[PDB]
Amino acid sequence: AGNATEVPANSTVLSFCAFAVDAAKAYKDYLASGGQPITNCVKMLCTHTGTGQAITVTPEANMDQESFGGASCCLYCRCHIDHPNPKGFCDLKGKYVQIPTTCANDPVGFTLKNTVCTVCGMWKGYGCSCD
């Protein structure tokens, strides 16, 4: 009974971060000792004629990005643990996340490390042009 959600390749990293006192640090440390990034994400087939923006309600990748379902990007969502917010809610679940194609091999690690410009909606360092 029930419907499987995960694949054997993610068991190690999902189990490690599911027990960690500090999941974000655990995943970065896990990546730093050569673990492979979390796979089985929700990759979108889209036109790549979108605004290029970071977090959106419909897929918005341009020609240098991939679009992903946002929850599949949320570490907290992938491990089913508490979210670091005071109110405990996720900013990515229910949205689409645009990831640079060069970083598309690790969507979960990208969003852990990066931040979105609240003025232009672009990733800082990967699209934000703000002075």
- Residue ranges for the known binding site for Zn(2+) are 74, 77, 83, 90, 117, 120, 128, 130
Residue selected from 52, 53, 65, 70 as contacting another protein according to rule CB under 8 A: 70
Q: Which is nearer to Zn ion, 47 or 125 (CB)?
A: 125
Phi-psi region of 57 (alpha: psi -120 to 50; beta: other; left: phi over 0): alpha
How far apart CA 67 and CA 119 sit, in angstroms, is 21
Query: Quick one: which of 126, 101, 130 has its CA closest to 115?
Result: 126
Order of strands, edge to edge, in the sheet holding 96-100?
55-56, 96-100, 65-69
Q: CA angle 55-60-61, nearest 5°? A: 105
- Contact partner at residue 117 from another protein, Zn ion, none, CB < 5 to 8 Å by partner kind: Zn ion
Q: Which is nearer to another protein, 105 or 125 (CB)?
A: 105
CB 85, min distance to another protein, A: 9
Residues of this chain that bind another protein (CB under 8 A): 1-8, 10-16, 18-22, 25-26, 29-30, 32-33, 35, 40-46, 58-59, 69-72, 74, 76-78, 80-83, 88-90, 93-96
